[PDB]
A paper describes a structure:
Encapsulins are self-assembling protein nanocompartments capable of selectively encapsulating dedicated cargo proteins, including enzymes involved in iron storage, sulfur metabolism, and stress resistance. Encapsulation is mediated by specific cargo protein motifs known as targeting peptides (TPs), though the structural basis for encapsulation of the largest encapsulin cargo class, dye-decolorizing peroxidases (DyPs), is currently unknown. In this study, we report the structural and functional analysis of a [name] encapsulin system from a Gram-negative pathogen – [name] (Kp). DyPs are ubiquitous, often homohexameric, heme-containing enzymes, named for their ability to oxidize and degrade a wide range of synthetic dyes – with concomitant reduction of hydrogen peroxide to water.
Based on gel densitometry analysis, on average 12 copies of KpDyP are present per 60mer KpEnc shell, suggestive of encapsulation of two KpDyP hexamers per KpEnc. To investigate the structure and cargo-loading mechanism of the [name]-loaded encapsulin, single particle cryo-EM analysis was carried out on purified KpDyP_Enc. The encapsulin shell was determined to 2.5 Å via icosahedral (I) refinement. In line with our previous analysis, the protein shell was found to be 24 nm in diameter and to consist of 60 identical subunits showing T1 icosahedral symmetry. The asymmetric unit contains one individual protomer that exhibits the HK97 phage-like fold consisting of the canonical axial domain (A-domain), peripheral domain (P-Domain), and extended loop (E-loop). The shell contains two open pores at the five- and three-fold axes of symmetry, with a diameter of 9 Å and 3 Å, respectively. Due to its size, the large five-fold pore represents the likely access point for small molecule [name] substrates to enter the interior of the compartment, as suggested previously.
Numbering used by the authors:
A (entry chain A), B (entry chain A), C (entry chain A): 1 to 267
The structure:
Amino acid sequence: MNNLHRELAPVSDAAWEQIEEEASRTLKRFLAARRVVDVSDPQGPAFSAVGTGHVTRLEGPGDSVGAVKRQSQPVVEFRVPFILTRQAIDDVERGSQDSDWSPLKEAARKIAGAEDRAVFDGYAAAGIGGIRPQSSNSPLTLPVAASGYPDVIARALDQLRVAGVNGPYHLVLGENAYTLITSGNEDGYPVLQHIHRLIDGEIVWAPAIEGGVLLSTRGGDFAMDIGQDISIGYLSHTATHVELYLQESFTFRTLTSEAVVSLLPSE
Amino acid sequence: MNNLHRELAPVSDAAWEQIEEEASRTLKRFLAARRVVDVSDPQGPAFSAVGTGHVTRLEGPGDSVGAVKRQSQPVVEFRVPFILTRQAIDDVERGSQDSDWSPLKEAARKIAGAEDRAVFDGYAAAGIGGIRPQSSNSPLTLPVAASGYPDVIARALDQLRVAGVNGPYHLVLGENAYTLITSGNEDGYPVLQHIHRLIDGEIVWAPAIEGGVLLSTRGGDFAMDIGQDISIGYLSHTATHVELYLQESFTFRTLTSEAVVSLLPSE
Amino acid sequence: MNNLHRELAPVSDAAWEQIEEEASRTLKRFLAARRVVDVSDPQGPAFSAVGTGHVTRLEGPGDSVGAVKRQSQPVVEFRVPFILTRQAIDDVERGSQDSDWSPLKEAARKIAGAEDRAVFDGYAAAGIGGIRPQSSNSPLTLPVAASGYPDVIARALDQLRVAGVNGPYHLVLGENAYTLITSGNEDGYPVLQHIHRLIDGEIVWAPAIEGGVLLSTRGGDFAMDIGQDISIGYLSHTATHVELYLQESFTFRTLTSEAVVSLLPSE
C-alpha cells in the first residue's frame, strides 16, 4: 500500500483497467516534450533534488575555515484532480464499452499541458528555466504563409551549425503552426517535402505551446529527471461520485543553451 | 437443413458455385463500412441482442425493493429478394460462361447500400444511431474544388488530435467526392500526394453515402456485431423462374463519439 | 475487486462468514419458485437479455429491403438494503454466538418475496408475465374446508391430462392453504394421504403468494435465467452502523401455458 490509496477507491478491477488504458492513450497523444528531451527512468518517491555540480561561497564558520554550499534543483510535483460519476464504474462490470471518461481526459490534457509548458517556457516557482527562454541563440519569427517556412528553418539550422551543435535536428510546432504547415499551399509548392528534406524526423505536434522550436537531439542537452511518472491516485468518494487525481514528479534542466533555437509565433 | 432452404431450390451445384462467386465479388466491391469498422465473427442465428451495460430505474416491486432493467440493442435482419430465369441456371451445366446474374448483382448492391447507410447515417427503426449523426465533433463541409481538400483534411485531423484520439486516420468518401479527388487538378497540384501524406491508408470508396467521414481505426470505437453474414436463401420457383434472397443479420454501435469527424457534401 | 465492494466494509472475516451462513439459511427457507421452475447456472454480470426467437416487422430501410427486429426479454436487478449496528460485527470476533441479524433476515424475506411474486404473479415493469396470469387453463377456486381439496386437485390433474402435459405434478400452496391442508380434519379423513397419493412429491410452501398452483415439472416449461445469484454488497458505514444490500439479477419466462393450473384463494 502506497500513497496512491487505490484499494480504498470503490472502483472495480475492470474499471481500473479501462481507466488506465484511456489515461495512457490520452497521455501519449498529448505529451510532446518527452519526444525531444532525454527522459530518465523513474527514480522513486524519495527523489527530491538533482545536484548541479556548482557551489556558493558562504561566510566562514570561524578561524581560517572556508565554506561552500552545493547547489541543486528541487523536484516539483504536479497533481490534477477529477471526478467520476460511479455509474460508469458500475457499468464497466455490467459490460459497458462507452463509459464516460471525459473528466479523466480533461485532467490528462491539463497535466500534459502543464508539464509541456514547464519544460518549454519554464516554471519560475519550481526553479525550471525552460528550453526557450534559456536559449543563447537569436529567436526567429515564423512567417504567416507556409511558403516562408523553409527559409526560417534553414536560417535556424544555420544558427545551430554555426554554434557548432551536431546530431539530428527536430522541430516542435504549436497547434497553429502545425496546422498551417500541414494544410499546404495554394501554389502547389511542396513545402512539406522541402521541410522533411531539411529536418531529421517528423514534426512534433505540441498543443500546449505557441510558435515553435528547433533543437538537436544528439543527447546531453536537455535533462528530464523523473521521480514519479504520471499515476492515478484516490482522494475521496461520495454515494454518487469518486474523486481521483493524476500525479507526476519531475525536474528539468537545460544544460546546453546553444543547441536550441526558439521560433516565435507569426504576427 | 437450415432456414436457407437451399436444397429445395431447383439449382444445380455448378450454378450455385457461380452464383456464390458472383455474389462474393460484388459484395466485396460494394461493401465499405466493414473496411473501417470493427467487424466481429458471426455469432449465429440465435444472436438477438447486445447488452450496452446501462440500466433504467423501474418502479419498485414493493416494500423497499429497488429494480433496474438492463439495456440492450436488438439485432436487425435485412432481406432483399431477386429472381432468376432458370435458363442461366440450366445453361451453367451445359457450359455457359456468360449467364445473366444481373438481378443478383442488383440485390447485392441494394443490400450493401442499406447496410452502409445504416452504419453511417443511422437507421432509426432498428435503433442504430449511425457514425455521422452521433459525432461530437463539428462537421466540416467539403470544397467544390479538389485543391481545397488538403485544408479540410488538415482541419479534421486537428479536430481528432485536439479531441485526443490516436491511431491511424482513414477517410471514407462518397462517389462524387472520390471521383473529384481522383480526377485531379488543372494547375498540376499533387493534391492526392498531399492527401496520402496526411492520411494513414487508402481512401475508401463508398457509393452509398454522400460527403465523407474521417475517423480513427485504433479499435474499440465502432462495433459491428454480426449474427448472420450475407447469405443466399430460397423462397419459391416457377416453371421459368427461381426466387432467391440475400439476407444478413447485424447490429451496430458507436462507442466513442470523438473519434469521428463528418464531412458534408459540397454546396 | 467487483461491484460488491465487500473489502471496503468494516466487517471482519468471522462476521462475514456468520452473515453469509444466516443469509443462505433464510434464503433456502423462504425461496419457493426455485423448487418448481428450471433454474439455470449464473450467467455473469454482463448477462443483459435473453432472446425469445421472434421478430417484429419494421418499416424498410429503402428500395425493396425488408427489415425485422429480433425480440428479447431484459434482465431485471433486485436490490434490498439493510443496516447492521456494528456491535454484533465487533462481538462476533469477541466470541458472540447470538449476534442480531434481524435486519439481514428481513431483507432476505423481502427479496425472496419479491422474486416469488415476480415469478408467480408477474412483474409488469420488468416484462415478466408470471406463471399464473399466463396460464391457458381455467383457474380453480380452493375450498374453505380441507375435505374438498382432493376433489379440486383431481380436477386440476384432469385439466393437465386433457391438455396433454406429462411428467411429475407438483402443487405450490400459500401459507393459509398450506396450514389448512396440514392442520387436518375433525372427521378423521386422511386428506393429506389422499393428496400425496395424487401428487408426485411434497407440497411446496410459498409464503409470498396466495391460493396455489398445480404445475408439471417435466422440464422446459418455465425458464429462470440467472445472471447474478443473491449476493451481499456494501454501500456505506457510520461510526455505529454498516449499510449492506442483498442483490440478485434474473429474468423469467413461461414457455408452455398449458402446463400450469392456477388455484385461487378460498372465498
